[PDB]
Amino acid sequence: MEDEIRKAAEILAKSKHAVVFTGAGISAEGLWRKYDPEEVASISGFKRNPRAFWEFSMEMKDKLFAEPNPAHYAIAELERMGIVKAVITQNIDMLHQRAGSRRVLELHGSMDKLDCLDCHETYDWSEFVEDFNKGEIPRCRKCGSYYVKPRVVLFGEPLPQRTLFEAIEEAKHCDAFMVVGSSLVVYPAAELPYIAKKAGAKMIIVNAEPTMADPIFDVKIIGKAGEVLPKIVEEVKRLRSE
């Protein structure tokens, strides 16, 4: 990746409007999973078994309570340098903002806000996180319903149109598009790199494993984001020195 990292840094260095696209892989992490996200984290599943969704979240607490890693800081640095103008993410933990990124387009929402499906009461995550931490499943303090849904896009749910539009435009007008930690198997998000490819942007991908979209990237890197990204950023700094 020595050569690739250098090449990736060279593209970003010259770009005028780079966009980053991140997935679950940005964070390094029986055989089959006890909780199948396509079921417990699907809208049909939630409208039928809300508690299953929360039990699943609790099992993923370490990831939900994870803090920014070097990849998030590297990405925030690239924006600060004016090289990265937008970060499109499928993630819902707000780690990009928590790391310093400003223009973050959350394709799938975030845990920040929640609504009771039955009485429509809205809540802030801060109102349930302490219960959630001790294994208590959030329940509406108004009507007692277990249908307390966070404003995150579940499988089978339409993505927020406002965010989707801006993400599409960023892809349509960027001159460099870098995928970080995304296996690109979640749609419609997975279509954004292709829109950028169609736009003529230079393509870069950093992922632990190869993807079916790999063929369209100008530079491909296999590895952990948290280890790869800072390396790139450091090579970008040198390209912007005296």
Binding site: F155, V185, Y187, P188
Partner: peptide, 9 residues
């Protein structure tokens, strides 16, 4: 109208 789905080739 774009619903979230997962698909692997």
């Amino acid at each position: 109208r774009h619903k979230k789905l997962m698909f692997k080739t």
